[PDB]
């Protein structure tokens, strides 16, 4: 079974140290390897201070938004 969210599921972030903390994002892809610690690649509408719109997040550092 494919682990994590889907390749178009909307998600929000519970990572304290992220720029998009408590901000929603779009799951690009989830690495199905059970050895990558941060498989959930998320895409965000607004860039961070490094002019980057995406980062890999963990499964527990993420929350499938109900919208």
């Amino acid at each position: 079974p494919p682990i994590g969210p889907k390749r178009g599921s909307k998600v929000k972030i519970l990572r304290r140290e992220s720029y998009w903390f408590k901000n929603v994002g779009s799951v690009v892809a989830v690495d199905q390897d059970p050895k990558t610690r941060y498989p959930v690649v998320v895409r965000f509408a607004k860039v961070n201070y490094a002019n980057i719109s995406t980062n890999n997040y963990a499964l527990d550092e993420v929350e499938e938004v109900a919208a």
């Binding site: 304290r16 140290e17 992220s18 720029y19 903390f21 961070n48 201070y49 490094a50």
Partner: protein, 734 residues
């Protein structure tokens, strides 16, 4: 611990560069960051350092007393005080030219001298201390107290008396003793002085240590106190004709509550201050016996904080767990302490000018200005330090898992709201204060001062009218005779208070106007903006979206690199450092306002301030340009006068205020790449290859250079304004 000079830090000792010297100077008193440190040793070093500071305080006061006793005209000043100049100390400068010796000879002195603008003359004369031998005795006693504090600080570093970590954390017994004894018994003892000495000294006779056991401060003597007939201590209030220092018009009362000022000295009554210190002595001795120490009664501050959780959770977990984040954290203790100290220092400044306690201190005008400026700049600095130490607490000492959801973590939960609404209030105040000031600048520019926006401060005039000031016709609680406030106090203190406040010549509740409104809103802008910077650095001390790991970098660190757009001045230290600029600006505003209002009151033309304080070219022309004439003419090509030192200090403060701009504007990288060329030149210059540094000469570090620029900046700010405020107020003296 280490090898080279920073023995307290083997990271700077193992630094080949000159940064070792600087950082070992700076981080010397940061005991929390030293090597091989324990909470026990930290507390013990703090205790011994407090002893050292008390020793230096008593030594500095002994020096004041000695240099007024030896080189002062204090015996001549107590004869005709309001027409004889104080003398701080003598001067032996071998660079002085003979004109400068002719000029600095003041106060009827054998040589050149310095005028005590500090008020120690007035204060010492008010508390007794008539002859110079009394000041000599005081200096000897304070030398003894300095040696006693040094003895205590050395003794409480030895193992037999090194107090334990759990003894400095006894936060109930310490409050009990300090409220009861340090605050209460000390106020009680000052009442004892004011009653046995200072009141008899004001009323003639000189009650000294040889003859104080056989003179009665009150002719009955402890009958009234023990019998409860305390009104007998308010029988003869030396009403309205008493000459301070002589028995003409004197009285017998020692604790009469009169309110208002002496008629002669325009200071408060020593009976009033005796009764005052007695009353707060009772209140502090009562408030002391509150916290449980050893005896099975009293409160535990824990179960007061733990119990103050509101149902409904509007605060959250309340103060549940806040005893531990203050008792175990010395930076919270220091932040609260400096907060209270800055508040009460500002209070000292704001009350000592309007309710002067010392004899003939309202009559010498430079003294009041120097004192208000001093205590307000001290208060602004102490407030900036309160906040800086709150930031250092949030970084070093704050444990979020110990204080989850309590009243302190809820700060960081919504820190953006606090910071953004402070950023609203300051922005509103600046936009509108500056807009009105610029509107009035342009109206006076276009020759239409009637078009000015002169918003009357109705809400402060209403408070003045709630205190008996019959200058606005509001007819409020104490300006109205038919009121409960003008009935329950009309027999006790409102006579003197009304007759003091209604006098337009004193500083008690000055008649204000629209310039006072505008400058009060400039003051509010300064306070709100300094608060914004400091609170923002304190709450973003642990981290932000730009640097969430800031807590791992400590309080003072330069930056986080050019990445992520750029992280210059991101530390909480940098917030402090920018807030010192905004603080000095704020206190410059409050003290410009004070000094111009008061120099216009003392001159006589209050209309000058009232018509000229509403537009900024009035502050530049009629205050800075006008009052600085006698200052900058302290030394002209054809001679000099006594204000030559203040002109020189004025220009000196300008020079260092400008030199701070070198370190603030010009940053590192240019200087390291300059000193590389200098090092090349020294290593290739003949007859100087012989000489070689032992410390590799690097440029100043970044955060260091922000500090050094801030130090030059503040030194120049302070020296410039001290020179201008003393020279202008001493060139004419009202």
């Amino acid at each position: 611990m280490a090898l080279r000079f920073p023995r307290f830090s083997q990271g700077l000792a193992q630094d080949p560069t000159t940064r070792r010297i600087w950082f070992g100077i700076a981080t010397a008193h940061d005991f929390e960051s030293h090597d091989d440190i324990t909470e026990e040793r930290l507390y013990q070093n703090i205790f011994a350092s407090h002893f050292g500071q008390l020793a230096i305080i008593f030594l500095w006061t002994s020096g004041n007393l000695f240099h007024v006793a030896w080189q002062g005209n204090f015996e001549t000043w107590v004869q005709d005080p309001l027409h004889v100049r104080p003398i701080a100390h003598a001067i032996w400068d071998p660079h002085f030219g003979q004109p400068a010796v002719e000029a600095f000879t003041r106060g009827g002195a054998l040589g050149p001298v310095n005028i005590a603008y500090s008020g120690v003359y007035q204060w010492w004369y008010t508390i007794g201390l008539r002859t110079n031998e009394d000041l000599y005795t005081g200096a000897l006693f304070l030398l003894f107290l300095s040696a006693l504090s040094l003895i205590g600080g050395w003794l409480h570093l030895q193992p037999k008396w090194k107090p334990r970590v759990s003894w400095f954390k006894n936060a109930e017994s310490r409050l009990n003793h300090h409220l009861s004894g340090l605050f209460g018994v000390s106020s009680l003892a000052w009442t004892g002085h004011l009653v046995h000495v200072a009141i008899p000294a004001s009323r003639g006779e000189y009650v000294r240590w040889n003859n104080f056991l056989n003179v009665l401060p009150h002719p009955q003597g402890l009958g009234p106190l023990f019998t409860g007939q305390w009104n007998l201590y308010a029988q003869n209030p030396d009403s309205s004709s008493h000459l301070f220092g002589t028995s003409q018009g004197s009285g017998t009362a020692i604790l009469t509550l009169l309110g208002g000022f002496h008629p002669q000295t325009q200071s408060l009554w020593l009976t009033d201050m005796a009764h005052h210190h007695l009353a707060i002595a009772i209140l502090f001795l009562i408030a002391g016996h509150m916290y449980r120490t050893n005896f099975g009664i009293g409160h535990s501050i824990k179960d007061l904080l733990e119990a103050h959780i509101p149902p409904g959770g509007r605060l959250g977990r309340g103060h549940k767990g806040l005893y531990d984040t203050i008792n175990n954290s010395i930076h919270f203790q220091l932040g609260l302490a400096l907060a209270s100290l800055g508040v009460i220092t500002s209070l000292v400044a704001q009350h000592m000018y309007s309710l002067p306690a010392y004899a003939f201190i309202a009559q010498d005008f430079t003294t009041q200005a120097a004192l208000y400026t001093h205590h307000q700049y001290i208060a602004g600095f102490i407030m900036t330090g309160a906040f800086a130490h709150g930031a250092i607490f949030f970084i070093r000492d704050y444990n979020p898992e110990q204080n989850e959801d309590n009243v302190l973590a809820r700060m960081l939960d919504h820190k953006e709201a606090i910071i953004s609404h402070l950023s609203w209030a300051s922005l509103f105040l600046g936009f509108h204060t500056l807009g009105l000031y610029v509107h009035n600048d342009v109206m006076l520019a276009f020759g239409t001062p009637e078009k000015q926006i002169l918003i009357e401060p109705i809400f402060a005039q209403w408070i003045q009218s709630a205190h008996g000031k019959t200058s606005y016709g509001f007819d409020v609680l104490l300006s109205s005779t038919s009121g409960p406030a003008f009935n329950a106090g009309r027999s006790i203190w409102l006579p003197g208070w009304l007759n003091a406040i209604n006098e337009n010549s004193n500083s008690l509740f000055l008649t204000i106007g629209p310039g006072d409104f505008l400058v009060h809103h400039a003051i509010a802008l300064g306070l709100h903006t300094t608060t914004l910077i400091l609170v923002k650095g304190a709450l973003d001390a642990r981290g932000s979206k730009l640097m969430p790991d800031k807590k791992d970098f400590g309080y003072s660190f330069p930056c986080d690199g050019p990445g992520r757009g750029g992280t210059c001045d991101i530390s909480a230290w940098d917030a402090f450092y920018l807030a010192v600029f905004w603080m000095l600006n704020t206190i410059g505003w409050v003290t410009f306002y004070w000094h111009w209002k008061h120099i216009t009151l003392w001159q006589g033309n209050v209309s000058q301030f009232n018509e000229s304080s509403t537009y900024l070219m009035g502050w530049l022309r009629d205050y800075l340009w006008l009052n600085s004439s006698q200052l900058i003419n302290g030394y002209n090509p054809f001679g000099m006068n006594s204000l030559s030192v203040w002109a020189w200090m004025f220009l000196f403060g300008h020079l260092v205020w400008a030199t701070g701009f070198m370190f603030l504007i010009s940053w590192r990288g240019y200087w390291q790449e300059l000193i590389e060329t200098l090092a090349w030149a020294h290593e290739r210059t003949p007859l100087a290859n012989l000489i070689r540094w032992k410390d590799k000469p690097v440029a100043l570090s970044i955060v260091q250079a922000r500090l050094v620029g801030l130090a030059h900046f503040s030194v120049g700010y302070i020296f410039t304004y001290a020179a201008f405020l003393i020279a202008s107020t001493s060139g004419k003296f009202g």
